[PDB]
């Protein structure tokens, strides 16, 4: 009647087929309460968007570092950036904290009171910060092409695609971290090592992943 | 509504029409300190005195600092002006502080007794005719008369604007003095020297680069 | 030189004690290798000892005939001779925190008094209310003196006393 | 909103700028003069800064114009930012003294007509000497119009006044900017731009300065 | 009915065929919103016209001045009017005309009056098609001409992208690279320069240097998305 | 998990969490600021 992560197992009661990417996966019943579930929806979406950006950036810089262009790998790019350019890391870090604190506090107090942030308090901007749904702000600023507007079915499809590519990118970033922890080289370094000899070059032949042998 | 946090629950004691009449009520009370109306009245007075004192002091810090940085004056930095000002003085700092404490406690006790009982310093015969002018106005903290020579409170059309300007410039100057203290403790140079050093290289000369503010 | 005490910067037993502790630690150190975990640990402990003694001697402490730092609890003797940060300033540093704890507890009790089952909000903490009060109780001296000046800090004699009062 | 000329044809004009003020082009992107009394002050403030800026930029250009033509003054050729260092029959101390005293008279007169129009239209000494009634604050009239203007054509004349005035305000701001930037006299800067207009733009000078 | 980009496809519901060039291609649904579709329509129009003039300019340049390279033709002009005065005049005049077009976009009937001379103004027209002094001598119907304009413009947009990538991977001009393709069809295509296989990636080198001097500075001139190249 | 979070709101669990947090804060203070006998800074 609907795709479920563990087939046969019926979905829990709080996971109806209303949210994007709903497959009934809550074996710990973490989002049982609706307000907590809204908080976790926004958390999944922010994590997945940040992870989509992160995975795309890692993939692109690894593409540029593999073909021989002057690119550091994702585990070395911060040092290279703050050392090549004369960048002070505490200054940059607190600049980022100021900007992200403004943005995320706006988003926070639109979670706590959804109608807010649109009173013209910020700079007169009312309808750019009104917010469409929980985790989907929309507006002229976060949606200049208006893809949430117009067609609704296309918007639900894009929601599914967004959350699904986001979970995939989160898994991909966790995989980047684990592969740097294991093989010590870049992600596409690992990919080329796999494509060279798929057998005999994989996680079973690290020495760290399977410690038995 | 002019909230300090646009989405926050403004406390109920700052939403009452008594507190919304106060100058610059942007609903900032995340500690619930002026919940009692008598306490809020006393704290309005405290904010006003603190903000006027801070505006005077921060003027006397940056204006002559800006004029000795512009070569117009030779006033030293504020954290050293007392030492060199008491050397050219007729008095030591102890006797000067004694006279200052007497002359300040007198008027501050007058203000105290006017806060405790509004308009009470104007009961006749207390001063030698000047008590006629010490009754203050309907609004506490805005005494007027001898303290308002240019009659700028008699218009009743810019009055809320005057109050808002006063309290906002005053909160700004309170923060400015707190920053002067912090920057004397942190950089050791003058506030205008700090401004020049930041404007020369902002991305490398700031509180993120000294080894005192962020010690990690 | 408040109570005949010598400053720790010029005390001889203080230096003798530093040398004694460092001699003990290097006696333990000589049995280990150059760069081993025991050797690095003992070197770190020696450095912590040296820094501790240097920082106590720098802070203007007064040492006795035993070389140990002696604190000055008297305000007036501490504020005059530069020993306020020994007992006197940490006094208010404590009292702020302690009255803060007590005021948050009082506010929580007064808050849960009005509910239907007030005792169940004491075995089961209302963490939202508790955190809200724990954050907004940082102004406990001002709010406490304002509750005191209004007379709403102390209960009247509706207190449960005994037959002979 | 009306069919008056605007600073941005098609912009949402604010509304409180209805055209009653000379120079109404709806330019209030900060919405500064939203209050009526604020605008009643700002009108006269603009007019005074404007007239003082017109006098100012006249005193900037014309001295250097008669210098670059080659006339005869003892204070000829000297810049406007080096005219404070010039010496005269008196030091600048007594000059500021007399200047501030006379201006404390006349500006307080102007202010007393501003807070109540019709007040200061008469002399202390000569009661018979008077300014006529019906004049606005900022436009005193009477002996201030001794050559017979302002009978008609008053709206366009006020428009011309405020237009040349805003232009001279911008001119003096540019004089400050170029005297701190180029280090030369402003008419020498004009001549420098007229020599090589394409490589003596502000971007080129700023980039060669850094 | 109308000719679609896919002959058997049903077009999106917002694409009813009313626009000039509505061949039913909105697979992402970017013009689903009615308000953003107008901005995207004007964007297509100006991208079209800019790319058409740009392609004609590169073509004419490689015809009548083949010694210069259009990718390099910024540093090989050396006008006496300065590199900054050029930027100044173009910045100011383009800011003027583009803000006028933007005010046509925001408020449609607003900016038609000639500001300086009061007696001229444009007629009330559509958004994106001013007419009047812009458009004398219309050779035929208007809708067919708009269709032709947008089609030649889309072809010119793709043509400028091809120009850029063929100037990057070959270092030659459009007509020069076309003569290279005609001199060896099977050996000069992008398929014959590049190949990625599961085990090997062959990206062609770009003949555009990483940076050009241009009078005492270092202008960074990177190939477009090298690395992502095949 | 409303009941589970109610359980974590009980007196002993909240005390464990709060005293773990307090003890860890004091411990990290005493790590990064070793041997604080007086208020010198
Ligand atoms: C009144 C506002 C004000 C202003 C304009 C400045 C300006 C400056 N400060 Mg000071 N400062 C202030 C308040 C202020 N400070 C206060 C209240 C504190 C105590 C928390 C400090 C503590 C402080 C230290 C310890 C240091 C500076 C330094 C500096 C300079 C670099 C900025 C920096 O490192 O981050 C400033 C640090 C902060 C913690 C920011 C506090 C500002 C608060 C949040 C209010 C202002 C916000 C306001 C909305 C925007 C500015 C208003 C302005 C337009 C009027 C710069 C000249 C550094 C310096 O001297 O470099 C040469 C430096 O080492 N400041
Ligand atoms: C009751 C008597 C008593 C007293 C007065 C002390 C006093 C002290 N002991 Mg001793 N001790 C005692 C009993 C006592 N102890 C007992 C019974 C034992 C056996 C368990 C010990 C075992 C012991 C050891 C083993 C050690 C001490 C140490 C210390 C020092 C700790 C200083 C410190 O932590 O700085 C803390 C400084 C602060 C400023 C923190 C104050 C608290 C808060 C955080 C301040 C608020 C700031 C801010 C607003 C918080 C932010 C809010 C947050 C939620 C974000 C101090 C001299 C240490 C030392 O070196 O002694 C010299 C040490 O190593 N003690
Ligand atoms: C949030 C996700 C994320 C994060 C944290 C980073 C972080 C970084 N990227 Mg990556 N990147 C990302 C997404 C991300 N990227 C995506 C989605 C793409 C596509 C890229 C493409 C990309 C390239 C092509 C390059 C970087 C570079 C960088 C570094 C410096 C960026 C810089 O100079 O600021 C830029 C600041 C501004 C533009 C001002 C605003 C830094 C390690 C650069 C580098 O040196 O690291 C290898 C670099 O060359 N990134
Ligand atoms: C608990 C009672 C107590 C006792 C017995 C003393 C004892 C003394 N005080 Mg202290 N003093 C105390 C409490 C006490 N003090 C308190 C609570 C204060 C207020 C904070 C002071 C403030 C104080 C000052 C300001 C001075 C003394 C001085 C003195 C000496 C006289 C003597 C050693 C004097 C001193 O320096 O002694 C040499 C001195 O000048 N005392
Ligand atoms: C519109 C008002 C105005 C303006 C913009 C200036 C501007 C200037 N004056 Mg002038 N000045 C003015 C009114 C004004 N003054 C008045 C009313 C008096 C009194 C009559 C003076 C008397 C005066 C003297 C005596 C000197 C200046 C100087 C200066 C320069 C100071 C530069 C600096 O900060 O160092 C600057 C160009 C100084 C200067 O040019 O030295 C380089 C200088 O020596 N001014
Ligand atoms: C996208 C438009 C565009 C752009 C940015 C360029 C840019 C360039 N062209 Mg190319 N060109 C274009 C279109 C364009 N061209 C078209 C459409 C043609 C065919 C007519 C040409 C024919 C052409 C030749 C034959 C040559 C260039 C050259 C050059 C370079 C120097 C230009 C110069 O010296 O002009 C100087 C400035 C002028 C001549 C004044 C412009 C003429 C008047 C004022 C008309 C402008 C207004 C007019 C109404 C057009 C507005 C509509 C617009 C949207 C098209 C420069 C790299 C030269 C080169 O390679 O450098 C050595 C060169 O030899 N171009
Ligand atoms: C629109 C447009 C586009 C797509 C380009 C594209 C390019 N320009 Mg040109 N350019 C433009 C406008 C444009 N420019 C304008 C308006 C100016 C005048 C300021 C220039 C001045 C200019 C110079 C002076 C140079 C370029 C260069 C370049 C190349 C950088 C890689 C690339 C082919 C550089 C180049 O030739 O790279 C090889 C170069 O040196 N451009
Ligand atoms: C100036 C400047 C310079 C010299 C470079 C240099 C580079 N960039 Mg570019 N880049 C810059 C600014 C700059 N970046 C800014 C401001 C943005 C935004 C980007 C966005 C960007 C992307 C999206 C990509 C590059 C890439 C690259 C690298 C390969 C060249 C290329 O684009 O193909 C090269 C290291 C590419 C990399 O290779 C994988 C690439 O895909 N850059
Ligand atoms: C894996 C992950 C989360 C996994 C969560 C899972 C499985 C949750 C499972 C469950 O809860 C549910 C669903 C339901 C419960 O009932 C059951 C369980 C089982 C409990 C998140 C990753 C989240 C990952 C994120 C957010 C990654 C962001 C990455 C970024 C920003 C990368 C940035 C950079 O790499 C670049 C781009 C370039 C570098 O040079 C600089 C840096 C900064 C290093
Ligand atoms: C009076 C004042 C400064 C006065 C300065 C003077 C006289 C300076 C004088 C001198 O320099 C000169 C002129 C010349 C020098 O040579 C000599 C001296 C003498 C040195 C500063 C006040 C400075 C006052 C300050 C900084 C007060 C800050 C208060 C804050 C932030 C309160 C925050 C909150 O209380 C609210 C608002 C609501 C709560 O619910 C939440 C919280 C967050 C608790």
**Contact by Cβ (8 Å): C111, C103:** no
Tokens of E91: 């910045």
* CA E155 to ligand 8 center in whole angstroms: 27
Question: Which secondary structure element, helix H or strand E, spans residue E202, and what is its range?
Answer: strand E200-202
DSSP letter (8 states) at residue E122: P
Ligand of minimum distance to the alpha carbon of A95? 1
Place of tokens 């929601």: A159
Instruction: Point out residues after which chain F has a gap (C–N over 2.5 Å).
Output: none
Q: Where are the domains of chain C?
A: 1-165
| List of residues 6+ apart from B150 with CB closer than 8 A | none
Tokens of C84: 């306020």
- The rounded Cα A121 to chain-centroid distance in angstroms is 30
Tokens of B37: 């109306």
Tokens of B23: 């100058």
Rounded to 10°, the helix E83-106/E34-64 angle is 150
Question: Which secondary structure element, helix H or strand E, spans residue E197, and what is its range?
Answer: strand E195-197
Q: How far apart are CA B162 and CA B152, in angstroms?
A: 9
Rounded CA Rg of chain C: 26
**Contact by Cβ (8 Å): A147, A155:** yes
- The rounded Cα E23 to chain-centroid distance in angstroms is 20
DSSP letter (8 states) at residue D130: B
The terminus-to-terminus CA distance of chain C in angstroms comes to 53
Minimum CA–CA partner of A148 in chain E: E33
Alpha helices (H) along chain D: 36-69, 92-115, 154-181, 186-195, 202-209
Please give the resolution of this entry in Å, rounded to 1 decimal: 3.2
The reply to whether A191 sits in an annotated binding site is no
Q: How far apart are CA A74 and CA A76, in angstroms?
A: 5
C165 touches chain B (CB under 8 A): no
Place of tokens 């690894």: A62
* Residues forming a β-bridge with D189: none
Place of tokens 């912590």: C48
**Contact by Cβ (8 Å): E144, D42:** no
Place of tokens 């464990």: F16
Tokens of E227: 């690395």
**Contact by Cβ (8 Å): A59, A51:** no
Q: How far apart are CA F37 and CA F41, in angstroms?
A: 11
Q: How far apart are CA E154 and CA E55, in angstroms?
A: 12
3-class SS at D144? Answer: helix
Give long-range contacts, CB 8 A cutoff, 24+ apart: B203-208: B203/A87, B203/A88, B203/A91, B204/A86, B204/A88, B204/A91, B206/A91, B208/A88, B208/A90, B208/A91, B208/A93, B208/A94
Tokens of B12: 């109920």
| CB of residue A175 inside a 6 A radius of ligand 9 | no
**Contact by Cβ (8 Å): B155, B161:** no
| Torsion angle, alpha carbons of B163, B166, B168, B172, to 10 | -170
Strands lying side by side in the sheet with C62-63: C6-7, C62-63, C69-70
Which of B125, D141, A143, C22 minimizes the C-alpha distance to E36? A143
3-class SS at B31? Answer: coil
Q: Beta-strand (E) ranges in chain C?
A: 6-7, 62-63, 69-70
**Contact by Cβ (8 Å): B36, C146:** yes
Left, alpha or beta for C10 (phi > 0: left; psi -120 to 50: alpha)?
Answer: alpha
DSSP letter (8 states) at residue A85: T
**Contact by Cβ (8 Å): A55, A174:** no
Atom of ligand 5 nearest to the CA of D95: 20
Determine phi and psi for F10, rounding to 5 degrees. Answer: -65, 165
Place of tokens 């006279």: B99
Place of tokens 């008196």: D90
| Helix, strand, coil share (%) of chain E residues, nearest 5 | 45, 5, 50
Q: How far apart are CA F22 and CA B196, in angstroms?
A: 43
Q: How many Cβ atoms from other residues are within 10 Å of residue E22's Cβ?
A: 19
Place of tokens 């009047």: E132
Give long-range contacts, CB 8 A cutoff, 24+ apart: C61-65: C61/C7, C61/C8, C61/C86, C61/F37, C61/F38, C62/C1, C62/C2, C62/C3, C62/C5, C62/C6, C62/C7, C62/C8, C63/C5, C63/C6, C63/C7, C63/C8, C63/C11, C63/C13, C63/C14, C64/C5, C64/C6, C65/C13
Tokens of F29: 């203070």
Ligand 5 neighbours, Cβ below 6 Å, are B 70; D 81-82, 84-85, 92, 95-96
* Residues forming a β-bridge with E200: E197
Neighbours of chain D (3+ CB pairs under 8 A): B, E
| List of residues 6+ apart from D1 with CB closer than 8 A | D13, D15, D26
Chain C closest CA to B12's CA: distance in Å? 15
Helix/strand/coil (H/E/C) assignment for every residue in F6-34: HHCCEHHHHHHHHHHHHHHHHHHHHHHCC
The terminus-to-terminus CA distance of chain D in angstroms comes to 46
Ligand of minimum distance to the alpha carbon of B14? 10
Atom of ligand 6 nearest to the CA of E76: 62
Find which of B70, B150, B157, B159 to mutate to test the D interface (most D CBs within 10 Å of its CB).
B157
**Strands C69-70, C62-63: pairing kind:** antiparallel
Q: How far apart are CA E143 and CA E126, in angstroms?
A: 12
Known binding residues of D for chlorophyll b are 7, 51, 84-85, 99, 105-106, 109, 123, 131
Q: Where are the domains of chain F?
A: 1-41
Using most ligand atoms within 8 A of CB, pick from B54, B56, B77, B172 the residue to mutate for ligand 10. Answer: B54
**Contact by Cβ (8 Å): A136, A40:** no
Nearest CA to ligand 3 atom 4: A54
Alpha helices (H) along chain A: 34-66, 77-84, 89-112, 139-142, 152-182, 187-196
Domain F1-41 maps to which CATH number in 3.40.50.300, 1.20.5.510, 1.10.260.40, 3.40.50.720?
1.20.5.510
DSSP assignment of A158-207: HHHHHHHHHHHHHHHHHHHHHHHHHT-S-HHHHHHHHHH-TTTSSGGGSS
Q: How far apart are CA E70 and CA E83, in angstroms?
A: 17
Minimum CA–CA partner of C87 in chain F: F38
| List of residues 6+ apart from D157 with CB closer than 8 A | D149, D150
Rounded to 10°, the helix B37-69/C140-149 angle is 140
**Contact by Cβ (8 Å): C38, C32:** yes
């Amino acid at each position: 009647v609907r795709p479920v992560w563990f087939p046969g197992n019926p979905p829990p009661a709080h996971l109806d087929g209303s949210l994007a990417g709903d497959y009934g996966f809550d074996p710990l019943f973490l989002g049982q309460e609706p307000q907590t579930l809204k908080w976790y929806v926004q958390a999944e979406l922010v994590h997945g968007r940040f992870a989509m950006l992160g995975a795309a950036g890692i993939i692109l810089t690894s593409i540029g570092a593999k073909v021989g262009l002057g690119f550091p790998e994702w585990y070395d790019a911060g040092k290279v950036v703050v050392e090549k350019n004369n960048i002070d890391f505490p200054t940059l870090m607190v600049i980022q904290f100021y900007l992200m604190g403004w943005a995320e506090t706006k988003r926070w107090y639109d979670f706590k009171n959804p109608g807010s942030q649109a009173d013209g308090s910020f700079l007169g901007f009312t309808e750019e910060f009104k917010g469409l749904e929980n985790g989907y702000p929309g507006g002229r600023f976060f949606d200049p092409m208006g893809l949430s507007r117009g067609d609704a079915a296309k918007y639900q499809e894009y929601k599914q695609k967004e959350v699904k590519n986001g979970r995939l990118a989160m898994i991909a970033c966790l995989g980047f971290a684990a592969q740097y922890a294991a093989t010590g080289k870049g992600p596409l370094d690992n990919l080329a090592d796999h494509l060279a000899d798929p057998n005999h070059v994989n996680f079973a032949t690290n020495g760290v992943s399977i410690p038995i042998a | 509504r002019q909230s300090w946090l646009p989405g926050s629950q403004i406390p109920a004691h700052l939403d009452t029409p008594a507190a919304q009449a106060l100058a610059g009520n942007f609903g900032f009370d995340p500690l619930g300190l002026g919940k009692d109306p008598v306490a809020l009245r006393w704290y309005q007075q405290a904010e006003l005195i603190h903000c006027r004192t801070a505006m005077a002091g921060v003027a006397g810090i940056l204006i002559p600092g800006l004029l000795t940085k512009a070569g117009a004056l030779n006033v030293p930095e504020w954290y050293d002006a007392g030492k060199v000002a008491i050397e050219n003085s007729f008095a030591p700092w102890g006797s000067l502080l004694a006279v200052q404490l007497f002359l300040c406690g007198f008027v501050e006790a007058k203000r105290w007794q006017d806060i405790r009982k509004p308009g009470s310093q104007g009961e006749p015969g207390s001063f030698l005719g000047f008590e006629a002018s010490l009754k203050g106005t309907s609004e506490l903290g805005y005494p007027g008369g001898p303290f308002d020579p240019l009659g700028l409170s008699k218009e009743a059309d810019k009055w809320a604007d005057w109050k808002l300007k006063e309290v906002k410039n005053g909160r700004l100057a309170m923060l400015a003095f707190l920053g002067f203290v912090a920057q004397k403790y942190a950089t050791g140079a003058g506030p205008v020297d700090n401004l020049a050093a930041h404007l020369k290289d902002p991305w490398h000369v700031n509180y993120a680069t000294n080894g005192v503010s962020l010690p990690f | 030189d408040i109570a005949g005490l010598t400053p720790c910067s010029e005390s001889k037993a203080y230096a003798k004690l530093e040398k004694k502790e460092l001699k003990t630690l290097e006696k333990r150190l000589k049995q280990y290798e150059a760069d081993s975990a025991p050797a690095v640990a003992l070197k770190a402990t020696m450095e912590r000892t040296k820094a501790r003694f240097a920082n106590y001697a720098k802070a203007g402490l007064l040492c006795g005939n035993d070389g140990l730092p002696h604190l000055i609890a008297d305000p007036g003797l501490a504020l005059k001779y530069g020993h306020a940060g020994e007992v006197f300033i940490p006094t208010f540093g404590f009292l702020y925190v302690a009255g803060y704890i007590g005021y948050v507890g009082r506010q929580y009790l007064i808050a849960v008094k009005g509910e239907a089952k007030p005792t169940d909000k004491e075995i089961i903490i209302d963490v939202p209310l508790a955190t809200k009060l724990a954050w907004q109780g940082a102004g406990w001296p001002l709010a406490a003196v304002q509750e005191l000046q209004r007379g709403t800090l102390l209960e009247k004699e509706e207190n449960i006393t005994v037959s002979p009062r | 909103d009306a069919a008056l000329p605007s600073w941005m044809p098609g912009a949402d004009l604010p509304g409180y700028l209805n055209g009653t003020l000379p120079g109404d082009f709806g330019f209030d992107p900060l919405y500064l003069g939203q209050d009526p009394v604020k605008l009643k002050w700002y009108a006269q403030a603009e007019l005074m800064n404007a007239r003082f800026a017109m006098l100012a930029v006249a005193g900037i250009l014309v001295p250097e114009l008669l210098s670059n033509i080659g006339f005869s003054w003892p204070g000829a050729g000297v810049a406007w930012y080096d005219a404070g260092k010039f010496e005269y029959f008196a030091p600048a101390s007594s000059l500021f003294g007399v200047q501030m005293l006379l201006f404390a008279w006349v500006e307080i007169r102007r202010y007393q007509d501003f807070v109540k129009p019709g007040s200061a239209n008469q002399d202390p000494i000569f009661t018979n000497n008077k300014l006529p009634d019906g004049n606005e604050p900022g436009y005193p009239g009477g002996i201030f119009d001794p050559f017979g203007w302002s009978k008609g054509d008053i709206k366009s004349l006020k428009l011309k006044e405020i237009k040349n005035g805003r232009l001279a305000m911008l001119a003096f701001a540019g004089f400050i900017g170029q005297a701190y930037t180029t280090g030369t006299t402003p008419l020498k800067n004009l001549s420098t731009h007229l020599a090589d207009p394409w490589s003596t733009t502000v971007w080129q000078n700023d980039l060669a300065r850094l | 009915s109308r000719p679609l980009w896919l002959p058997g496809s049903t077009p999106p519901a917002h694409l009813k065929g009313d626009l000039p060039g509505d061949f039913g291609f909105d697979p992402l649904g970017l013009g689903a919103n009615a308000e953003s579709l107008k901005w995207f329509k004007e964007s297509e129009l100006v991208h079209s016209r800019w790319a058409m003039a740009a392609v004609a300019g590169i073509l004419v340049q490689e015809i009548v001045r083949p010694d210069v390279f259009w990718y390099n033709a910024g540093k090989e002009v050396e006008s006496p009017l300065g590199p900054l005065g050029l930027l100044a005049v173009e910045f100011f005049l383009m800011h003027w005309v583009e803000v006028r077009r933007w005010q046509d976009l925001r408020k449609p009937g607003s900016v038609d009056q000639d500001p300086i001379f009061s007696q001229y103004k444009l007629p009330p027209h559509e958004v994106g098609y001013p007419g009047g002094v812009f458009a004398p001598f219309i050779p035929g119907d208007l809708a067919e001409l708009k269709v032709k304009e947008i089609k030649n413009g889309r072809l010119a947009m793709l043509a400028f992208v091809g120009f850029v990538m063929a100037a990057q991977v070959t270092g030659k001009g459009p007509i020069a690279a076309l003569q290279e393709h005609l001199a060896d069809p099977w050996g000069t295509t992008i398929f014959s320069k590049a190949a990625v296989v599961p085990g090997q990636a062959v990206a062609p080198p770009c003949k555009i240097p990483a940076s050009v001097s241009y009078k005492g500075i270092e202008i960074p001139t990177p190939c477009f998305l090298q690395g992502l190249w095949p | 998990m409303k009941d589970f979070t109610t359980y974590l709101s009980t007196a002993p669990v909240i005390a464990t969490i709060w005293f773990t947090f307090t003890a860890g804060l004091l411990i990290e203070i005493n790590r990064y600021f070793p041997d604080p006998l007086v208020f010198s800074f």
